[PDB]
Amino acid sequence: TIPHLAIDPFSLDFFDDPYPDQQTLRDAGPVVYLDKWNVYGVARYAEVHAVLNDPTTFCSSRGVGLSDFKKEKPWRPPSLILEADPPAHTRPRAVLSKVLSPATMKTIRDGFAAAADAKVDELLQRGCIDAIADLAEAYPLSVFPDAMGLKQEGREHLLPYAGLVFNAFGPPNELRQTAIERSAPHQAYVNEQCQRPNLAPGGFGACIHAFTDTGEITPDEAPLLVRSLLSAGLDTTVNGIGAAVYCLARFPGELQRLRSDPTLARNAFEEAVRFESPVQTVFRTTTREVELGGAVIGEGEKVLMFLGSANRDPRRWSDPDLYDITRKTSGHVGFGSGVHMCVGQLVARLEGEVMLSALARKVAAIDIDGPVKRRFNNTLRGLESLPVKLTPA
């Protein structure tokens, strides 16, 4: 009944070009079995959306990577939000939602926007740049560590730590084992910065610690919730902004439309999230026997959701393989869906919008002018290097 496939969705060949294999995964059936890793897979929009929206059957507290926390020790103490189910999930979720609130966005927007304009002006003086190191990495590093309230020293640990986190969701392949081999210093830095005295007043980290007296979280929960933001809050935005720049570089007609109406910036970024899906995959674990698209999945099974494939499923999207900055993007699953849907999405969208606005107003052309290099990670999709020439408007 369930087709068995040998595709390794965590192989370098797959990362290098996932799209043919994602169509094979979709077209084989609504539910497949991946013999390489002994997990169920769902690659169509409908089943990805259904699974994400049934957290009782498809739980998160046994891990959202391959490893099952009922069978193996997690590589670090479980996240109190990502790797929790309701009800334990609910109040930590509420705290992070208030920390990363509309009011907070109002407080940081003008500085995020000025930082975005400044970086584009700086890049335009250089002309030829690497849109990864010099833009997609450099811009989030100039606003996000400061918005967290982190000291200057040790920030070189943040992207290595995030890479480790996202590799650690994957199977025990060489990418994961090498990441864990190298983890100790990045882990030590990140855990230390989560302590209340290390987080500058008015920042995200200080605000989490200040929320430890409401009956929602206790003081000993606040360090791990800071850890969540230092895990999920930087590398994702690097790859999201990198996706959007890569899209604009590959689709000049869409850069030209965005220049003509910079208010399209927010949707141009949302579409880049759908088109490249920086977070490619998430797992769940079944808490009971369940029917899903005609397959009977037993209890205690890992299920792998292909977010990138769901976002390119022709059953749900017209011309899914086109980048369209006026597409109605509502409903894509690049930020997830349901109770765990990205609690940091307002920060991500704010960074993406003000960077795309800056490019829309200041840049006339983005031309790839050098070898493109992909970056390989078990969970994140994005580039290592993207040489572009920027032409001023």
Ligand X SMILES: CCCc1ccc(C(=O)O)cc1
- Least separation in angstroms between CB 216 and ligand X: 16
Q: Does 76 bind Cl ion (CB under 5 A)?
A: yes
With CB under 6 A as the contact rule, the residue among 347, 355, 356, 390 that binds ligand HEM is 347
Distance CA 393, CA 390 (A): 9
Closer of 239 and 357 to ligand X (Cβ): 239
* 227 annotated ligand binder: no
136 binds, among ligand X, ligand HEM, Cl ion, none (CB under 5 to 8 A by kind): none
Among 22, 60, 61, 79, the residue binding ligand X under the rule CB under 6 A is: 79
Close Cβ partners of 342 (under 8 Å, ≥ 6 residues apart): 232, 335, 336, 348
DSSP label at residue 380 = B
Site string for ligand HEM, 61-80 (x = CB under 6 A): ---x----------------
| 236 is an interface residue for ligand HEM by CB under 6 A | yes
By CB under 6 A, tell whether 205 contacts ligand HEM: no
347 binds, among ligand X, ligand HEM, Cl ion, none (CB under 5 to 8 A by kind): ligand HEM
CA distances from 306 to 31, 32, 233, 320, 355 (A): 11, 12, 21, 15, 28
Sole window of 210-218, 225-233, 260-268, 294-302 interacting with ligand X (rule: CB under 6 A)? 225-233
DSSP element (H, E) containing 235? helix 235-250
Does 93 help bind ligand HEM (rule: CB under 6 A)? Answer: yes
* DSSP string covering 245-290: HHHHHH-HHHHHHHHH-GGGHHHHHHHHHHHH-SB-EEEEEESS-E
Q: Is 93 marked within a binding site?
A: yes
Question: For residue 133, what is the DSSP state?
Answer: I
Asked if 217 is part of the footprint of ligand HEM (rule: CB under 6 A), the reply reads no
CB of 187 to Cl ion, least distance (A): 4
What residues form DSSP beta bridges with 363? Answer: 392
Look at the block and give the residue holding tokens 């369930």: 2
The one-letter amino acid at 354: V
Q: How many CB atoms lie within 10 A of CB 59?
A: 19
User: Does 342 show up as a binding residue in the annotation?
Assistant: yes
For Cα atoms 92, 83, 221, give the angle at the middle one, nearest 5 degrees. 40
Q: Which two tokens stand for residue 138?
A: 């450099």
User: Do 241 and 355 form a contact (C-beta atoms < 8 A)?
Assistant: yes
Between residue 133 and residue 172, which ones bind ligand X under the rule CB under 6 A?
Answer: 165
Residues that bind ligand HEM (CB under 6 A): 60, 64, 81-82, 93, 96, 100, 228-229, 232-233, 236-237, 240, 273, 278-279, 282, 334-336, 340, 342-344, 347-348
Residues that bind ligand X (CB under 6 A): 64, 79, 81-82, 165, 228, 231-232, 279, 282
